[PDB]
Amino acid sequence: RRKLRTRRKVRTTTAASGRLRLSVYRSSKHIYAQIIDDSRGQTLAAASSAALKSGNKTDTAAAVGKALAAAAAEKGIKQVVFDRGSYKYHGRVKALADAAREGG
Amino acid sequence: KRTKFRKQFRGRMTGDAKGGDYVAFGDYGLIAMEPAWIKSNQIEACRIVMSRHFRRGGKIYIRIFPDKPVTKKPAETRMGKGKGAVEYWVSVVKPGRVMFEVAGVTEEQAKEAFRLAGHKLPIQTKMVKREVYDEA
Amino acid sequence: AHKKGVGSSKNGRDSNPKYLGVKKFGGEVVKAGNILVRQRGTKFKAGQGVGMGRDHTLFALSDGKVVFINKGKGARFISIEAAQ
Amino acid sequence: QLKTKYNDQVRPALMQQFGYSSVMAVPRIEKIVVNEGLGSSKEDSKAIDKAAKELALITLQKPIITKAKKSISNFKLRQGMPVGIKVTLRGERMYVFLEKLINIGLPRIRDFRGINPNAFDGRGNYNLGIKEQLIFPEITYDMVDKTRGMDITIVTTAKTDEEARALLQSMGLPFRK
RNA sequence: UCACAAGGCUAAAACCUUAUGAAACUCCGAAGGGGCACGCGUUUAGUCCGGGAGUGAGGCU
RNA sequence: UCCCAAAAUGUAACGGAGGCGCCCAAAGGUCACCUCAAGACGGUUGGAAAUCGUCUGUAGAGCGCAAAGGUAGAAGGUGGCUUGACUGCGAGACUGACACGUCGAGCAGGGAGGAAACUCGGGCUUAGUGAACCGGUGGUACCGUGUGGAAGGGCCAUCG
RNA sequence: CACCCCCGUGCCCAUAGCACUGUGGAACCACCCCACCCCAUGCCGAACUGGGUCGUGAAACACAGCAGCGCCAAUGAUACUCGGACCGCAGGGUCCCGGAAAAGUCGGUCAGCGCGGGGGUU
Ligand SMILES: [Mg+2]
Ligand SMILES: [Mg+2]
Ligand SMILES: [Mg+2]
Ligand SMILES: [Mg+2]
Ligand SMILES: [Mg+2]
């Protein structure tokens, strides 16, 4: 159940890593794919789909991942760690990663 | 009297009454003025004494209970282990504690019934009445 | 050999050497490795820069200064806040 | 099969029968749970396979072998031994088995007058008691070993027994009036 | 958790009002104690290396 | 292990209680997923608990065994793949009169699971143990009585 | 912090929680819809997961009300107690001097401080 997000989130051992967190809200057909810095309660990058998607909803999969990888690279965000909700890392969510992994 | 099941053996120590009101249940009561170990048979004496005096009613509240094992001298020894559980059961009674309280019987029908019970007790006592409102 | 028990009931000599407790306290200059707590379960859970050994023992990862975090009671943490 | 007659004669009828302001507030049928409770008296390595064949033909779903809760009581009670058999039905498979009942299963029952209409699962859910087995369309003595019985439960989105009972009757349900 | 006092209640377990006991019970919890830093002070010991020991029956409050 | 033990540690008794001299190639590594005991109402074997269903439900369950601590964001319960139940080491501590005993970041060689951050040098932890001597077995080729071999020894490993 | 609001995520784990009454829908979010394959249920697309609208905000979520329950909780006095000094054969008890609970009572709360993106002020 809801235990899944807290399970995946807690296993993402925060400031011991040094690395930044990569949230994903793949629950709807509107993401948030945020880049959150562990230490300061602050969000650095982030790329959504609510305002303009070009018609796509589960197809925009790579686009929003590619958009974020580009959006981060501007600030110099190179080292990062991903965090799914209850998301099994397979389609809509696996794309966002594979598009960021290849997009820088 | 004795308890149903437990641990077997205990220990011993003392200081002023913890949980013992004055009223509740009955109208008149009996209060310990000295710290003691009230034997099971000691209470069973008081019950019987007060019981007889009232004849019919049984409106006697025994607030104390022998929740405590005491041990004894098999014959002499010392060379050997811990002692016999089965000597007696006791209720540790510190001054202020209500041991007994009576209902429905008159002022004198109680002054005397408690006076008799006192004579079966190892400690100084006193009779009590009303105006004890902490919780009800 | 008689029908009575090989093991005689009712004993008491039995007990054990036994140790434990907190080793480094709130506001102490630790070196790396220095044990901060010996415990059974997780009385204190590992905090920032503090490792947890197999037997729930809490050791320092980096030199610094010991800080204790008592989150309401039930969730306790030992962390290191370096002087550098 | 079905689903539309569930709407047409029940859905607008209930919004008029009661006072529903939404088509989603109107009660539905969540699931039909089929539970076989063999074992204890029928502890056979052969009986487990037998119940599966009978069930996988009426419901057309693979049945789970709901093992013992590791309880070791005075009587015949132990660890993880196969005891009961369960099959949960939803959607088409639920509707196919439900239709196989009201139209074929239910009338083809010996000593039949209807089912107990009293307030069952207080929070609007129904529990059906089937005393026999040789009453079903796919259940015949020509391909079975002996004789048995079974238990079925209806899960509804109804808030009370009042709303649940009505939903069942209009859907087609025999009651002992 | 275990033990337990008067009553309600119900088909006794539970549950409710009033009422308690606890080394091996604890929703709480002191005074004290212990570690560390500092010495605003006042003192005077300590540590380490090497020679020689004796003592490892204690007694009362 | 718990109590005695006087809220740091430690602390005695022919003081109060109880367990151990193992077990597990999965009960280990890892990665995924799952969430309990009990009650009430309703249901075919049954009818006291029970296989099912829905409400309540920080745990009243579980954790191979004793107990205490601990634990559901799992240490509980399922599965996929795998043996890190590795070799060479050990910054710095704990703890002991010593001899022992414990925890251990990090470095190398080779790997295992994962997409990855990573994690893994046995098991949620605290019991399942036995110095040294003499000898068994596998490796190694250090000594070897003038020299070169060999017998014998030494060194790792391990058994009694 | 232009003023509101919604979705993510956080510090903070009850003064943040529950129940009960209500406001919310075409912006967001949920159910819903179908699903043959990626991939998945020791049985079932309940769940994961894939393809999208309407319909309805029902249920869930979000906000707002309220002190019935939880939760927090004084002041006073007390228990106890460091130190000082005593009584009693004893169980036990006292006086001075500072430290000072627990329970209860008054009363307090239907939280508070962030970062990012979305939508409105016709
Ligand atoms: Mg309180
Ligand atoms: Mg003083
Ligand atoms: Mg004194
Ligand atoms: Mg004296
Ligand atoms: Mg004073």
Curated annotation (Swiss-Prot), chain A:
Q: Name one GO cellular component term.
A: cytosolic large ribosomal subunit
Keyword Ribonucleoprotein assigned: yes
Matching entries from InterPro entries are given as: Ribosomal_uL18_bac-type (IPR004389), Ribosomal_uL18_bac/euk (IPR005484)
Q: Which GO terms describe its biological process?
A: translation
Q: Which GO-annotated molecular functions does the record name?
A: 5S rRNA binding; structural constituent of ribosome
Entries under Gene3D superfamilies matching the protein: 3.30.420.100
Lineage top rank: taxon? Bacteria
Which Pfam families does the record cross-reference, listed alphabetically? Ribosomal_L18p
Q: CDD domains, from UniProt?
A: Ribosomal_L18_L5e (cd00432)
**Which UniProt keywords are listed?**
Ribonucleoprotein, Ribosomal protein, RNA-binding, rRNA-binding
The record's note on quaternary structure and interaction partners says: Part of the 50S ribosomal subunit; part of the 5S rRNA/L5/L18/L25 subcomplex. Contacts the 23S rRNA. Contacts protein L27 and the 5S rRNA.
Task: State the family named in the UniProt similarity comment for this chain.
Answer: Belongs to the universal ribosomal protein uL18 family.
PANTHER family the record matches? 39S RIBOSOMAL PROTEIN L18, MITOCHONDRIAL, LARGE RIBOSOMAL SUBUNIT PROTEIN UL18M
- Stated role: This is one of the proteins that bind and probably mediate the attachment of the 5S RNA into the large ribosomal subunit, where it forms part of the central protuberance.
This protein is called what?
Large ribosomal subunit protein uL18
Task: Give the originating organism.
Answer: Deinococcus radiodurans (strain ATCC 13939 / DSM 20539 / JCM 16871 / CCUG 27074 / LMG 4051 / NBRC 15346 / NCIMB 9279 / VKM B-1422 / R1)
UniProtKB/Swiss-Prot annotation, chain B:
The UniProt keyword set, sorted, is: Ribonucleoprotein, Ribosomal protein, RNA-binding, rRNA-binding, tRNA-binding
Matching entries from InterPro entries are given as:
Ribosomal_uL16, Ribosomal_uL16_bact-type, Ribosomal_uL16_CS, Ribosomal_uL16_dom, Ribosomal_uL16_sf
Which superkingdom does the taxonomy of this entry point to? Bacteria
Which chain regions cross the lipid bilayer? none
The GO biological-process annotations, alphabetized, read as: translation
Pfam family of the protein (one): Ribosomal_L16
This entry's Gene Ontology molecular function terms read:
rRNA binding; structural constituent of ribosome; tRNA binding
Fetch the CDD domains from UniProt.
Ribosomal_L16_L10e (cd01433)
Cellular-component GO terms for this entry? cytosolic large ribosomal subunit
Q: Which NCBIfam families match?
A: rplP_bact
Query: Which family is this sequence assigned to?
Result: Belongs to the universal ribosomal protein uL16 family.
Q: How is this protein named in the record?
A: Large ribosomal subunit protein uL16
Q: Which organism is it from?
A: Deinococcus radiodurans (strain ATCC 13939 / DSM 20539 / JCM 16871 / CCUG 27074 / LMG 4051 / NBRC 15346 / NCIMB 9279 / VKM B-1422 / R1)
UniProtKB/Swiss-Prot annotation, chain C:
The protein's UniProt keywords, in alphabetical order, are:
Ribonucleoprotein, Ribosomal protein, RNA-binding, rRNA-binding, tRNA-binding
- Tagged with keyword rRNA-binding: yes
Supply one GO CC term from the record.
cytosolic large ribosomal subunit
Q: Record's superkingdom? A: Bacteria
tRNA processing found in the keyword field? no
One GO MF term, please?
Answer: structural constituent of ribosome
GO-annotated biological processes? translation
A Pfam family matched by this chain, by name?
Ribosomal_L27
Subunit (UniProt): Part of the 50S ribosomal subunit. Contacts protein L18.
Q: Which NCBIfam families match?
A: L27
Tell me the protein family, please: Belongs to the bacterial ribosomal protein bL27 family.
Give a short account of what the protein does: Binds the 5S and 23S rRNAs and also the tRNA in the P site.
By what name is this protein known?
Large ribosomal subunit protein bL27
Organism per entry: Deinococcus radiodurans (strain ATCC 13939 / DSM 20539 / JCM 16871 / CCUG 27074 / LMG 4051 / NBRC 15346 / NCIMB 9279 / VKM B-1422 / R1)
Swiss-Prot record, chain D:
Q: Which domain of life is it from?
A: Bacteria
InterPro entries given for it? Ribosomal_uL5, Ribosomal_uL5_bac-type, Ribosomal_uL5_C, Ribosomal_uL5_dom_sf, Ribosomal_uL5_N
tRNA processing among the record's keywords?
no
GO BP term (any one): translation
Which keywords annotate this record? Ribonucleoprotein, Ribosomal protein, RNA-binding, rRNA-binding, tRNA-binding
GO CC annotation: cytosolic large ribosomal subunit
- A single Pfam family, by name? Ribosomal_L5_C
Which cysteines share a disulfide bond? none
One Gene Ontology term of the molecular function aspect: rRNA binding
Describe the family membership recorded for this protein in Swiss-Prot or TrEMBL: Belongs to the universal ribosomal protein uL5 family.
Q: NCBIfam families, from UniProt?
A: PRK00010.1 (NF000585)
Listed under subunit, the entry gives:
Forms a bridge to the 30S subunit in the 70S ribosome. Part of the 50S ribosomal subunit; part of the 5S rRNA/L5/L18/L25 (CTC) subcomplex. Is known to contact the 5S rRNA, 23S rRNA and the P site tRNA.
Q: What does this protein do?
A: This is one of the proteins that bind and probably mediate the attachment of the 5S RNA into the large ribosomal subunit, where it forms part of the central protuberance. In the 70S ribosome it contacts protein S13 of the 30S subunit (bridge B1b), connecting the 2 subunits; this bridge is implicated in subunit movement. Contacts the P site tRNA; the 5S rRNA and some of its associated proteins might help stabilize positioning of ribosome-bound tRNAs.
Name used for this protein in its record: Large ribosomal subunit protein uL5
Originating organism: Deinococcus radiodurans (strain ATCC 13939 / DSM 20539 / JCM 16871 / CCUG 27074 / LMG 4051 / NBRC 15346 / NCIMB 9279 / VKM B-1422 / R1)
